[PDB]
Amino acid sequence: DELGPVNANPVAACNEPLCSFDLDQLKLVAVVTGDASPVAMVEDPAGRGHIVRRNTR
Amino acid sequence: MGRQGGKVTQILRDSVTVTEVFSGNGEIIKNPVTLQLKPDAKQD
Amino acid sequence: VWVKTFSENNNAVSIDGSAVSHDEVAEFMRGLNGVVWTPKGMGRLVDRRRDSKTAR
Amino acid sequence: VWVKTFSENNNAVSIDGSAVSHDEVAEFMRGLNGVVWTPKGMGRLVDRRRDSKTARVEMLTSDATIEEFPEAQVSPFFKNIDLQTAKQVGGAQVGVPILVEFKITMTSNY
Amino acid sequence: YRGKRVSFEFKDIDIQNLLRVIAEISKKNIVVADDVSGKVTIRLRNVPWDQALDLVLRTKALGKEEFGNIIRIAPDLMVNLLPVNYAVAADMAARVKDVLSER
Amino acid sequence: YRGKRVSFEFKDIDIQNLLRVIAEISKKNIVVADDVSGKVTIRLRNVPWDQALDLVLRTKALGKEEFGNIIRIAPDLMVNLLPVNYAVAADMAARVKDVLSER
Amino acid sequence: FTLIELMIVIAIVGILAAVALPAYQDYTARAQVSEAILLAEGQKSAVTEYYLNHGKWPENNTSAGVASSPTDIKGKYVKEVEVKNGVVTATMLSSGVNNEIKGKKLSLWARRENGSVKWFCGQPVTRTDDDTVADAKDGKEIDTKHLPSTCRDNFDAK
């Protein structure tokens, strides 16, 4: 009666990664700089890459 | 263009001046905005 | 009598209904037509009915 | 009556249950539909049932994909494919159930 | 294809990260497809970005298509600028093409 | 094929938009077919439009056919004008064709 | 009751054609490639002379002094022949050829012998420096099976 019509499963959840891991675990991979302001690139103990810049956390 | 009815008043190569219609503290007033071209940029 | 669904396409109407018995559905079917149908074509609306994807 | 498992996919519900006898499962199966099913498609969920990898109760036959012709019908809303299986489980000296474990799969409407 | 000058240092990072980083620096808004490639290493000095980009494409990475505001990208080494004070750059092209071969 | 001088800057825009824009500037009344192509990027300075058009065609875009009043079109980079003060332009054509190759 | 001599002999000629099909189909392709090779050659002259007279490989057809247009050096199975820095590549047409060789090509390149040069023939190659070329690895090379025994040269043949 509800599957024959239209189905969405909305996002509201957790997903917020580096604020769940300690700072000395994170490793600086690279840095980018240009007109869009300077941005750092950093690696998780889980091996993900992230991009963060001045004023971010 | 736009909900504030932004009237095109100037056109440069880098940017476009328009006259918009804002409710400044309860008065309907002119807002002379200038839309720049699209580079990299971020705001909230 | 009342019936359930009615869905058209400006050439044919596929309807969905119900009747009181082997009689009023016979009255209704007689009021229309009766046909020997033969080479049927299968089309993506059939499967959308099997999919439930078009409500009926 | 109570039943065991219920697992859906917004087109069909594969259920897992049990009934008192050849009667209440007949009452229940009559309340739905009865069908001559024909060309069945085999799919990885079947083998995930043979693998035990999707938790259920492997008294049950598998499957949930086929093409159905109506034999008899009581709910205009439900197309039961068939009483996929049924086995009267007696129990032991530690205890009963005695009843008829069964499995059915059914696509509803719309 | 014109930008501020930059130095790109990427030590074993997703090209998707280099891309985003490159959008966070106002080098357009860059967006990939989903699964473009993987991870790359490059290290550039004194290169405008829009070039360090064209150059990143040729490493491993993708080609770029621009919608205008957004750009879609779909599926050490170093960079150094050589001044040519005396000759024209195009006269080098024959000899420079000849070192590259299929490299 | 003669017009006022212009500078075309298109950052990730539908060729249909560039076309209309080009009709809104009295460069004919331009009309496409429906689905001509998609989106393109170009950036020209000091180019008469009827040329910046021929040039847009060659980028990605279409060919043009004119009815007379209306024209139908059917399915950074930059432009720069080089003055040639001393030589004839046609004498360059052999060498200039030879850089282009299949580019 | 009777007639099987007509039925079997019509069906042995049918299967005979099916067995004779792949033989005529590579003999055939191998024949269409042998020409791409002939069209590639005879242009060695221009290239050789240009190199010996100047000490630099001809950049393109015009430099080598040949139909300034690659497409002007085509054939029945050859869609063209381009000289790119002394390397002469021959492209197989798309119409009138086998099936697994069309749009495919080979190359002829030479090497400084010092006072003269020696020519090679094989699968597409690109020139790196005046005395070095490399596989134009890209997927459009004519398959080894279609190349003569005289045109099995590798990028590093000396």
**What whole-number distance in Å separates Cα of residue D15 and Cα of residue D60?**
10
Kindly report the nearest CA distance between residue F98 and chain B, in angstroms: 34
The residues facing G117 across adjacent strands are G112
Who's near G144: CB < 8 A, 6+ residues apart? G123, G152
Name the residue ranges covered by the structural domains of chain G: 2-158
**Run of H or E residues at A31:** strand A27-32
CB pairs E-F closer than 8 Å: 23
**What whole-number distance in Å separates Cα of residue G14 and Cα of residue G19?**
9
- Helix, strand, or coil here: G99? coil
**DSSP for residue A27:** E
The residues facing B7 across adjacent strands are B19
F79 φ/ψ angles, rounded to the nearest 5 degrees? -120, 135
Q: Which residues on A lie below 8 Å from E9 (Cβ)?
A: 30-31
Label residue C42 exposed, middle or buried (CB < 10 Å: 0-12, 13-18, 19+).
exposed
CB F49 within 8 A of CB F6: yes
The residues facing B36 across adjacent strands are B15
Kindly report the nearest CA distance between residue A1 and chain D, in angstroms: 5
**What whole-number distance in Å separates Cα of residue F27 and Cα of residue F64?**
13
Mutate to test the interface with D, among C47, C50, C54 (most CBs of D within 10 A): C50
Label residue C25 exposed, middle or buried (CB < 10 Å: 0-12, 13-18, 19+).
middle
Q: Which is it for the CA torsion C8, C14, C18, C19, positive or negative?
A: positive
**Closest CB from E94, E95, E101 relative to G126:** E101
Method used to solve the structure: cryo-EM
What is the largest distance, in Å, between two alpha-carbon atoms of chain A?
A: 55
**Closest CB from E1, E2, E67 relative to F12:** E67
Q: What tokens were used for F53?
A: 């058009």
CB atoms B39 and E28 under 8 Å: yes
Q: What tokens were used for A30?
A: 């690279």
Architecture in CATH of G2-158: 2-Layer Sandwich (3.30)
The residues facing D106 across adjacent strands are D13, D80
CB atoms C55 and D10 under 8 Å: no
Residue type, G122: G
Residue B41: closest CA among chain A residues belongs to which residue?
A36
Task: Give the gyration radius of chain F's Cα atoms.
Answer: 15
Which chains touch C (3+ CB pairs under 8 A)? Answer: A, D
